[PDB]
Each structure stands twice: as C-alpha cells, then as structure tokens.
Design a binder for this molecule. Structure first.
Ligand code: HEC
Ligand code: HEM
Ligand code: HEM
Ligand code: HEM
Ligand SMILES: Cc1c(-c2ccc(Cc3ccc(OC(F)(F)F)cc3)cc2)[nH]c2cc(Cl)ccc2c1=O
Ligand code: FES
Ligand code: FES
Lengths: 147, 241, 75, 67, 60, 378, 147, 48, 54
C-alpha cells in the first residue's frame, strides 16, 4: 500500500496530459538571406536555421575531425551544405548560444563561455557535446519541414 | 409554481458498485452531441485527445478533429488565420460570449454541458427525464411565447424546444434511432464527460476492498496478541493480618 | 514530568501474568463475548434510545406536515 | 416504420390500478376548471401526481427494450 | 521441525535481516499476483464493455 | 547508559511517546485525539500537492481546478482526498469534544481552552478553503460570512470593506483567502503542540473518572498498536468515500462557475456548520442572530464553571446521561433543520430546538448535578 | 515608529487605487416589458429595475407606515409611478433577493427568508433596513441614468 | 496616474476623452468604440 | 513561589531568554544570531503580505 500511494504522489509531479503535445513546423528558406541566422520557436525551445557561405563551408571542411571532443565530419550533420539547422540550446546547462560570436565565427554561450563553430560542433569550453541536429526534410526548393 | 417532481431511478448499466461505463454508448452519445447538441450548447473542458482510448483510435480522432476550422495566429505579418483542428484543440464554442448566446435564444443562456450531470440533483435521471418529458400543458394554464412545458424543469416552463425526435440521427453501427435510445446514449456520454475517472476509480476500489479485507483481521490479531498479557492477568490482596 | 517509580504508594498486592506466546488471542470470542455484548446493550439501550426515538417522531411529523401544507386546498 | 419502446411501455403502465385514480382526479380537475367561468385554478398538482406514479413503473421495464 | 511453521521460524524468522529480506521478496511477488487477480476479476465482471474488448472492431 | 533516555532530542520523544505512563482502561473514544493528529498531516500533504497546480486568479481558478481533476496524473485522487478529509476531520473533532464533555475532561482548564482555540482556528481554515474553487456556493458563502461582521455597530461597514479589499467579493478577496488558507494550518499545528504540552503535566483521564495512578502501563506497545488500528479504520472510511461516493457530502451547485448576479434558491453551507445556520435563522434580528451564533460556539468555554457534581464522569450519573443524549439528539435536530427552507413548521421547530439547546447546557445540567448530590447524601 | 509601520501594513490591505471604479450607467426602458423585473451589473452588484403594474401601485398604497419597521411612503422612493430602481442586495447579509416570490408579491431573500414588498420595503424578516435607492435621473420617458 | 502629478482632474479627463478605446460586448454581443475614461490605459500602437 | 519559574510554558522562556547564564565578554560578533531571527521574521511578514496580491 505504501509503495502504491508514494508512487502515485511522485507521478503527480511529472508532465501532465496537456503538455506532451508533439508537433512539426514549416520554415521558408527564401526568407533567410545568406549570412543570417534566423531563430524560431519549436517545442518550446529555440530552433536555429543558418544559411552558410562558401567560405564557411570550406573552413568547416578543413577541420581535423580527430582533434574534436565529439568527432563528426561536417557532411554528416547537414543535408544541403549551405543550410545548417540546429536546436539552439547549449549542451552545457541549457543557455542560448549567441550567433556571430566567439573565436571560431560560429556561436558563443556567455553563461560559461562555450565556443561552437559554424557546424555547431563543440570546440572550446565546458559543454560536453555538439549541438543537437533535429529530424527534418526539405519539401521543395523554398520550404523545409522540421519535426 | 413551487411544485417539484423527483425523477425516478432508472437501472443504468453503470448503476452498480463495480459496474463500468459501456463505451459503445459513449461513442453513440458523442455522435448525438456532435450532430444535434453542438449547435447551441458548449463543452469547454473536453478535447479531441481525450476521446482516444475510450471510444476512438488516434486515426479516427484525428479525422474527427480535422473537420473543424480553428482560428490560430498571428502569422509572420501579424494576422490571424484559420487552420484545421488538431488533437490538442478543445471542441469549438458555438457562440463567442454569453450575450450572443442570449440573443439567439430569446434571452435564455444554454448552460455548459461539461458538468451538467454533476451540477443537478438526479444526474443522468434528470437529463433523461427532461429529454423525454415534454407534453401538452395542463388545462387552465398559460405560458409565455418562446417557452415550452416540461414538468421536470423547475417552474414547469423551459426555453429549450424538444431537441430529439424519431430518426433525428443515423448511427454508424446500424442501431435503431429511437428517442429513448438517443436519450440513453447522450446521457451515457454526458456521464463520461462529467466524470472521466469512473472506470479507473472503480478498478482501484475493487483492489482497495480486497486489501482492506485482508489487512483488517491481521492487524486486529496483532493487537489482540499484544494485549493478551493484560487481558488475562489476576490480582490478589494479601494484607499482613 | 511524571515517570514510573513514585507515582503512588501500593502495598500487599500480587499480580500474575502469562506470556503472550503461551495463550490464545481469541479464547472464547463467540461463546462468552456475545452474552457480554447483550448485557451491555441491555444496560445502555434505555438510557440512549428515547431521545432518538423522539427525534424520529418529530422528523416524521414535520415532514408530513410540510408536505400537507404545500398541497392546495379546495376553495 | 420505427416505433420507440417508450410509447408502448407507457401505455402498458397506465393500465395499472394505482395510476387510474390519479388520472380520474386529473380529469375531474380538468372538468371543473374548463366548466368554470373564470378562476385562477390550475390543474398542475394532479398532472404531476399522475406522472409520478406513471413514471415509477416505467423505470423498471423500459431499459429491457433499449439495446 | 516436521511442521511448516517450525521450519519457517528456524529458517527465516530467527534473524531480523532475513525477516526483512523475506518481507521485500514477498511484496515483490505479491504485487504481481494481486494485480493480475484484481485485473482478471474486474475484466470478467465488465466483459464486453471495456475499450480493449471492443478495440478489434475499429482498428484495422 | 541508554542513549534514548539521555540524548537531547530523543529524550523528548521518549518522554512524550515511548515511556509515557497511561491508564490501562481507556476505551476507543480516546483514539480520536490521535486521529486528529493524522488527518491534519494528511491535509497538509494532499493540499501541498494541490498548491502546485492552483492559481488564485479569479478568471483562472475554476479552470485550474478542472485542469487538476482532468489533466494532472492521479490529480482527481488528491483533490477528492483533500475534499473529504475535511468531513473526516470534523467528524473526529466533534467526537473528541463529545468524549471530553461526557467523561469530565474539561476540568483540565488550560487544555480545554487551548482546544477551544484550535476548534475556532480549524473552522476558519475549513471555511477559507471552500472559497478557493470559486463556484456558486463559494461566492455566496464568502459574501455571507464577510457581511456577518456588518452587525457590529459603528465599525461594521469599514471592517467589511477592509476584509473584502474593495466594495464586493472580487479577485483581492480570493487571493488573500488563498494566502490565509495556506498559512493557517501551520499555526494550528503550533497550537496543537501546546495542547499536548499542557496535558503532559496532569496526565490523561479514564472512563471511570477515578485517578488511575495505581494502574498504569507504558504507552508503547499498547497504545501504538491501537493507534495503528484506528488509523487503518480511518483510512478505510476515507477511501470508501473517495472511491465509492466522491460527491455524497458535497453540493452540486459548486460545479457551476461563480455568478455575481444570480443566487441559487436553496443555498446552504457544508454539513458541519448547519447547526449554526439553524441558530442564526431562528432569531429574527441581525445583531441578536450574530450574537447567538457566536455564543453557541463560545459556550464551551463556560462548561467548566457550571460543574456542580461530586463525581467527575457521567459513568455513574444516570440523569446526566439522559440529559447528554437529549443534547445530542437536539444537535441532530438542528442539523436536520438547517438543510430545509425557511417555512412552516420548520421555523417553530428550529426556534424550539435552539431554546432547548441553550436551556440544556445552562440550566438543567447543574440542577441534575445538585439533585444527584442530594440523592447520594453528600 | 511602531505606529507608523503598523499603520502602513494595515492600510496595504485596504482597497487599492485601481479597484475604485466609480462610473454611471444607462438603461433603456423600452426593452423592459410590463410586469417583469430586470437586472444589470453595477460596481459588481445587481441593479433591479421593475416596471410595476397599476395593480401593485393600488395594493401597496393601502398600508400604514406604523406597521412598517422602516417608515417610508411608496411615492417617495420613485421619481415616476410605474418604475422602481433598487440595488439588488439584501440588507441582512447581502444575498440577492428573488423577484416575484414571497408572501407579499415583491422579493424573497431565501438565504434567511426575508420578505420585501413590491416597493422594496422589508415586511417580515431579519433585514433591518429597506433596499437602497441609488441616485438616478431620466432624460425622457424612454431611458434612465444611474450613478 | 497623471491626476495630481502634472494635470488636474479636468485636464486628465479631457486627455482621456481625446482618444477612442474598445469596449463591450453590448446586448447584441458586438464590440464597439467609446471615448476614453480615466481608468483606461494608454493605447497600444500595435495589436501584437 | 515564582510563577515565572514554575508555569509549564514560561519555564522555556525563562530558561532560554531571562536566566540563561552567558559569558560576560562576548563581543558584537555574537549579535548576528539574533539578527538572523529578526531577518527571518521580517521576511515571513513582508512575504505574507506580498502573497495577498501575487
Ligand atoms: C438550441 C436549439 C438548443 C439545442 C439544439 C439544445 N439545447 Fe439544451 N438548452 C437550450 C437553451 C436555450 C437552454 C436554457 C433553457 C432555460 O430555460 O434556461 C437549454 C437547457 C438545457 C439543459 C439545462 C436544464 C436545466 O435544468 O438547467 C439541459 C440539461 C439541456 N438543455 C440538454 C440538452 C441536450 C442533451 C441537448 C442535445 C440532445 C440539447 N440540450 C440541445 C437550447 C438548446
Ligand atoms: C487543516 C488543514 C486543512 C483543511 C481542513 C483544509 C480544508 C479544505 C477544504 C474544505 C477545501 C475545499 C475543497 C473543495 O470544496 O473542493 C480546501 C481546498 C483547498 N485547499 Fe485546503 N485545507 C487544509 C490545508 C491546506 C493546506 C496546508 C494547503 C496548501 C498548502 C491547502 C490547499 C488547498 C487548495 C489549493 C484548495 C483548493 C483546491 C481544491 O479545490 O481542491 N489546504 N481545503
Ligand atoms: C486540531 C485540534 C486538536 C488536536 C490535534 C487534538 C489532539 C489531542 C491529543 C493528541 C490528545 C491526547 C490523546 C487523547 O487524549 O485522545 C488530546 C487530548 C485532549 N483534548 Fe484535544 N485535540 C484537538 C482539539 C481539541 C478540542 C477542540 C478540545 C475541546 C473543546 C480538546 C480537548 C482535549 C482534552 C480535554 C483532552 C484530554 C482528554 C482526557 O485525557 O481526558 N482538544 N487532544
Ligand atoms: C527566508 C525567507 C525568505 C527569503 C530569503 C525570501 C527571498 C525572496 C527573494 C530574494 C525574492 C525576490 C524578490 C524580487 O527579486 O523581486 C522573493 C520574492 C517573493 N517572496 Fe520571498 N523570501 C522569503 C520568504 C517568503 C515567504 C514566507 C513568503 C510568503 C509566504 C514569500 C513570498 C514571496 C513572494 C510572493 C515573492 C514575489 C514578489 C516579488 O518578487 O517581490 N517569501 N523572496
Ligand atoms: C450562518 C451561515 C453560515 C455559517 C458560516 C460559518 C459558521 C462557522 C464559523 C464561524 C466563525 C468562523 O470564523 C472564525 F472562526 F471566527 F474565525 C468560521 C466558521 C457557521 C455558519 N454559512 C452560510 C453559508 C451560506 Cl452559502 C449561506 C448562508 C450561511 C449562513 O447563514
Ligand atoms: S550554459 Fe552554455 S556554456 Fe554553460
Ligand atoms: S442574507 Fe438576505 S435574508 Fe439573510
């Protein structure tokens, strides 16, 4: 009896039936010019869609993957080289990385100074992992559907 | 007038101590609500996601939700638009405010049906007798225009016309659509809407009864075992002459 | 404050007690318990009952009187 | 055609001993009020008296017909 | 020793650590047994009414 | 030698619970005082889990409670446990008071008066809780109790306005009622510590009414196991109410949102205040009615002063027993009357019941005590 | 110092600056039919408007003030004959009386059973005073303003 | 809030009356426009 | 004799705030114990009055 009642009381504090609420979203690629990082709201958190230039693409391609804390090549994290889509939540303690800041022209988390490159890979600071890449697909040349 | 009429006690299938609700009746009552009662009344605290796992599957519930226009916004330009419904959307309200409701019903406000079973003395009996109680007014009694006679309504004069009649609706499962059948189905659906925790409550009550019936005699026996030392002792008074 | 040892003075009293594992927990729970319960009920019923009987009579009379009053009378 | 069980159950109920007196008094009240030249008399009590006894019996046997 | 209760006392109930171990194991098995029995009784009393009884009709 | 008897913190618990000398013949009626200890903590637990989902805004209070019922995992269980725990608390409280009155426990004046304070505090907490759902009965009970202070001459309107925080019952009233409902149980527990402290010095009573220093036994293991059995029976009754009849003791009208304009035609308070509602309806006078309501509750403070018998307990006093059961029947009569409309013949019955209540408490009990003193020749 | 701080804390519980909200209201009298009572909101309280029939005026003028606990003639409380404006708050403890009820055909407060006659004068019950008559004025025989 | 700080009551009333704000519903359930009163907040320039 | 010493409730106050033997030479650094309690009661009162409008 004690186990059942304590379990019910503990489970009462967890997420309720009205907040689970999975969904998807559509984003217009033509609305984001080259060099701009556009932020949206998805599942209650920031979602970054950044249009990368050829210079940035080549710079990320020159990165020596073996030296990375979380090794991944740039071409296995994006579908189209000129578009990088990432969840804008710092992997350290959840702050928001600030675009066009830091020593690597990627992102900078000011809460504790985490530096990310233009691929979202962790390069300096305390964060343990690369920014999360969500599931998404391109429905046409102009639109992308993230889910 | 001050007269009142107590509804009789019908033998509902869930009237028993452990009996649960019949889910097919819930399905039929939901159809009755959707196609008849939703034009006037409102059901604010029920969503399409609640119907899943009671009388519909996820695909059927999504199909039901998609048949509604829901206003959402603002878009990127700062404008509100319409879209199809989702499972997270509550049922659409028929009017935007009480004044609009009163304007379309000669000043009578249709109450919300999300707790009407719990909000009246009689529960399902009151609603069933109300929906199947209309008759001609008694001799030598008048009434306003726009009101109808119903002996179960207090005052014996109600502003709702008879909503249900023969062949009003065609059920999906080929059931005959009689007045009493439709009344029974909608009453069961209203009972579910007021108290969605009916079946889980009775399931837990069965276990509670069994466990307490087990636990009472054992604890009583422990108490008797401890107190047997006191309950059997003896006293002797031996003064020294 | 109050503790065992000097609560009061007692002299010349002997007490015999038996261990709880040497005896039954329900010695005569039906043969002797029911007559004792009947004795106690017979003792207490005459003290406890008449007020509640009077309340029952008042309840019935008041309900009947109210119902009779509500109904209309000829003329 | 379609016929509800409720009408048949009501007609069977109304041929019981208890409800006959109530219907008789209802008809007498109707006669007195209609034949009167003018009054505030209102045969509402007799109608509800009839209906209470008529609906006591219907509740027992109505739900057997209903699926 | 031939009696069941004597074996239970001489085997389990002497120490208190073994008593507690017996209690937790008994609770672990009794949870599943009681849950299955109660669910079976509740399903039998209300057969043909629960969702799982009419589920097969609608989902393909 | 023994750490239990010499540690600074465990010594208090040892002297309070483990090694306490208690009488050997206290019946089951002495369990209710322990049960009130349990129920309080229960209301502190379940309520603390309702505060994590409740919002006191007037526009989002009814909706928040329905969200608790419908969306929170097992939230209906917690809600209805907190709802019926009030009824269980008041049943235990009235049984505690009746036990004290029958067996002459009121001679402990300090404990009796502290208990009267606790009774008033618990009544206030129960009333303030019933407003937070913000239904019809919530609105029209808050209105009536706040206007109850308007009868005081020359300051009534100002006090009413100050309590309301405005010209009527509105958002400010609901928020401050929520704050007081949250905070007052901690004060109740603090006062209950003193209720126990003043009883520790004099010891406990027994049904015979005779001092029981000769026959004492330790509190543990004899009255710990009875406490466990009583707690089990209490949990059984509460869960019966929760799981087999969740709305037997409630009111339907509180399931409609609050309407400042309309009023139901059959307003009534909760079942554990109806007797007061029977007294106030009896007197056709505002100040007189309010004074009668206050005195019907505060007459317990004058009970020790009216004692006139040589024997403490009613175990050996047949006339006092008859009058006591007449009083209990009269309280039941008032509780029945309070749930009925003001009309003939209930007005006369209510007035006669109130007169009989006050006459029994004030006049007849001392007279019976004196007569019994003369019968026993002392 | 103690008096000042305690006075400040006590005054904080009083009515705030925003909750005063005093303003007038206009009621059109063509909408109200004969022999009916209507309610409106004002200061979070009702506002009864009754279109009294001639029979009520004939009935309520045939009484003497000596019987009435609160002496007041019927003609004094109304600026026109077939109109009664009252605050719908019972003077006992604040419940709202129900129209066309009681043993005098006026109002019946059912919280404790107080009877008011058609004019709005207490006749049988624990209510000390009569229903209040707030200041009001007409512009024609069609509309009324209350403030 | 301006009254008794930098404007008289009459001045602040006229200032409130120089703008139109939304109110309702009326008896038909429609929203409508009325002159400002002292209790109205400063108009927002955009809906969102 | 003295009811300040014998009353069941007042003995705690006497043995905690009145007759408590204390060193004659404790400096101002021993004042922060009581100031923490003053602060705690201040926060409880102010907070309670803030909860009436939050
Ligand atoms: C508009 C054409 C309506 C439809 C269709 C239905 N109802 Fe209704 N209902 C309507 C009004 C204007 C009112 C208020 C009448 C009044 O006098 O206040 C109602 C009222 C009800 C009630 C409340 C009864 C009570 O005692 O409060 C119930 C329980 C009710 N109606 C049930 C109901 C059902 C089940 C309907 C679908 C079969 C239904 N109503 C349709 C207007 C309209
Ligand atoms: C002796 C202690 C208490 C008693 C007797 C008590 C009593 C009550 C009562 C009778 C209700 C009305 C419930 C209803 O009508 O639905 C209620 C509601 C409520 N109580 Fe308490 N209460 C106590 C302690 C507490 C505490 C300590 C808290 C929070 C810390 C709390 C939080 C609430 C809340 C949030 C509600 C409204 C939510 C609801 O309607 O369920 N209560 N209480
Ligand atoms: C929340 C409120 C209360 C709590 C928690 C409480 C708790 C207790 C407890 C634990 C005891 C000791 C055990 C027992 O004697 O049963 C006790 C005893 C007692 N209480 Fe209460 N009580 C409360 C209210 C009251 C009230 C309202 C009264 C009287 C009006 C009262 C009067 C007494 C008396 C007289 C005793 C001693 C009984 C005796 O030994 O003769 N208490 N109470
Ligand atoms: C040790 C005791 C307490 C401490 C240290 C404390 C501290 C604080 C602090 C630092 C804030 C933030 C204020 C701000 O940034 O505006 C705050 C806010 C608040 N506190 Fe407390 N608090 C205490 C006790 C309480 C209590 C007992 C209550 C109510 C019963 C309470 C109610 C509130 C409320 C309602 C707020 C929000 C209003 C605001 O932001 O000013 N606090 N508290
Ligand atoms: C008299 C009366 C009551 C009523 C309300 C409360 C009590 C008991 C009480 C008394 C005092 C109290 O405060 C205190 F403890 F002193 F702080 C808290 C509770 C007794 C009766 N409650 C009604 C509720 C409705 Cl909805 C309508 C009318 C009535 C009605 O006429
Ligand atoms: S939270 Fe991002 S670096 Fe710490
Ligand atoms: S509140 Fe109106 S009669 Fe008492």
């Amino acid at each position: 009896a004690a186990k059942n009642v304590v379990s019910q009381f503990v489970s009462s504090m967890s997420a309720s039936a009205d907040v689970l609420a999975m969904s998807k979203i559509e984003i217009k690629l033509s609305d984001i010019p080259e060099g701009k990082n556009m932020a949206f709201k998805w599942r209650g958190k920031p979602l970054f869609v950044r249009h990368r230039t050829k210079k940035e693409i080549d710079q990320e391609a020159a990165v020596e993957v073996s030296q990375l804390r979380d090794p991944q090549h740039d071409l296995e994290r994006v579908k189209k080289p000129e578009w990088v889509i990432l969840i804008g939540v710092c992997t350290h303690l959840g702050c928001v990385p600030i675009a066009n800041a830091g020593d690597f022209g990627g992102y900078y988390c000011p809460c504790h100074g985490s530096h990310y490159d233009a691929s979202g890979r962790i390069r300096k600071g305390p964060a343990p992992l690369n920014l999360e890449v969500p599931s998404y697909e391109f429905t046409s040349d102009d639109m992308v559907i993230v889910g | 007038s001050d007269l009142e009429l107590h509804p009789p006690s019908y033998p509902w299938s869930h009237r028993g101590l452990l009996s649960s609700l019949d889910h097919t009746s819930i399905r039929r009552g939901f159809q009755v609500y959707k196609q008849v009662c939703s034009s006037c009344h409102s059901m604010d605290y029920v969503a399409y996601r609640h119907l899943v796992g009671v009388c519909y599957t996820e695909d059927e519930a999504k199909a039901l939700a998609e048949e509604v226009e829901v206003q959402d916004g603002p878009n990127e330009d700062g404008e509100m638009f319409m879209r199809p419904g989702k499972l997270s959307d509550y049922f659409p309200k028929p009017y935007p405010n009480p004044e609009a409701a009163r304007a379309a019903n000669n000043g009578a406000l249709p109450p919300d049906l999300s707790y009407i079973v719990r909000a009246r003395h009689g529960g399902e009996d009151y609603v069933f007798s109300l929906l199947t109680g209309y008759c001609e007014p008694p001799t030598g009694v008048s009434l306003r225009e726009g009101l109808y006679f119903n002996p179960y309504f207090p005052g014996q004069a109600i502003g709702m016309a008879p909503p249900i009649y023969n062949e009003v609706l065609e059920f999906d499962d080929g059931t005959p659509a009689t007045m009493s059948q439709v009344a029974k189905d909608v009453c069961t659906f209203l009972r579910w809407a007021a108290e969605p925790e009916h079946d889980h409550r009775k399931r837990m009550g069965l276990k509670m009864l069994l466990m307490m019936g087990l636990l009472l005699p054992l604890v009583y026996a422990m108490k008797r075992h401890k107190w047997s030392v006191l309950k059997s002792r003896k006293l002797a008074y031996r003064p020294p002459k | 404050g109050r503790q065992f040892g000097h609560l009061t003075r007692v002299r010349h009293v002997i007490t015999y007690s038996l261990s709880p594992f040497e005896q039954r927990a329900f010695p005569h729970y039906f043969s002797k318990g029911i007559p004792n319960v009947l004795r106690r009920t017979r003792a207490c019923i005459l003290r406890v009952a008449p007020p509640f009987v009077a309340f029952y009579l008042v309840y019935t009379w008041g309900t009947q009187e109210f119902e009779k009053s509500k109904r209309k009378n000829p003329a | 055609e379609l016929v509800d069980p409720l009408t048949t159950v009501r007609e069977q109920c109304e041929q019981l001993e208890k409800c006959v007196k109530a219907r008789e008094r209802l008809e007498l009240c109707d006669e007195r009020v209609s034949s009167r030249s003018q009054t505030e008399e209102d045969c509402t009590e007799e109608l509800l008296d009839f209906l209470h006894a008529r609906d006591h019996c219907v509740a027992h046997k109505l739900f057997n017909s209903l699926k | 020793a031939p009696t069941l209760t004597a074996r239970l006392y001489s085997l389990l109930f002497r120490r208190t650590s073994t008593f507690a171990l017996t209690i937790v194991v008994g609770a672990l098995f009794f949870e599943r047994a009681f849950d299955q029995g109660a669910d079976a009784i509740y399903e039998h009393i209300n057969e043909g009414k629960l969702w799982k009884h009419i589920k097969h009709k609608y989902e393909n | 030698t023994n750490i239990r008897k010499s540690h600074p913190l465990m010594k208090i618990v040892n002297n309070a619970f483990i090694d306490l000398p208690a009488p050997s013949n206290i019946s089951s009626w002495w369990n209710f005082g322990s049960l009130l200890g349990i129920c309080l903590i229960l209301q502190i637990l379940t309520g603390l889990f309702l505060a994590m989902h409740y919002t006191s805004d007037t526009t989002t209070a009814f909706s928040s409670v329905t969200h608790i019922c419908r969306d929170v995992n097992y939230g209906w269980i917690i809600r209805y446990m907190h709802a019926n725990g009030a009824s269980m608390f008041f049943i235990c409280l009235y049984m505690h008071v009746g036990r004290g009155l029958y067996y002459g426990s009121y001679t402990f004046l300090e404990t009796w008066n502290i208990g009267v304070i606790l009774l008033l505090t618990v009544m206030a907490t129960a009333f303030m809780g019933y407003v937070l759902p913000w239904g019809q009965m919530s609105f029209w009970g808050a209105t009536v109790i706040t206007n109850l202070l308007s009868a005081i001459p020359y300051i009534g309107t100002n006090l009413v306005e100050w309590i309301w925080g405005g010209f009527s019952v509105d958002k400010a009233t609901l928020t401050r009622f929520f704050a007081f409902h949250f905070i007052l149980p901690f004060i109740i527990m603090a006062i209950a510590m003193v209720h126990l402290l003043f009883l520790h010095e004099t010891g406990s009573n027994n049904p015979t009414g005779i001092s029981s220093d000769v026959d004492k036994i330790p509190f543990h293991p004899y009255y710990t196991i009875k406490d466990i059995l009583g707690a089990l029976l209490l949990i059984l009754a509460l869960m019966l109410l929760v799981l087999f009849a969740p709305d037997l003791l409630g009111d339907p009208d509180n399931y409609t949102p609050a309407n400042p304009l309309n009023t139901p035609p059959h307003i009534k308070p909760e079942w554990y205040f109806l007797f007061a509602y029977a007294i106030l309806r009896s007197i056709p006078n505002k100040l007189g009615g309010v004074l009668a309501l206050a005195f019907s509750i505060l007459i317990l403070a004058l009970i020790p002063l009216l004692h006139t018998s040589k024997q403490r307990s009613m175990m050996f006093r047949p006339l006092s027993q008859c009058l006591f059961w007449a009083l209990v029947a009269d309280l039941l009569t008032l509780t029945w009357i309070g749930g009925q409309p003001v009309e003939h013949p209930y007005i006369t019955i209510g007035q006669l019941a109130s007169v009989l209540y006050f006459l029994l408490i004030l006049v007849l009990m001392p007279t019976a005590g004196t007569i019994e003193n003369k019968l026993l020749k002392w």
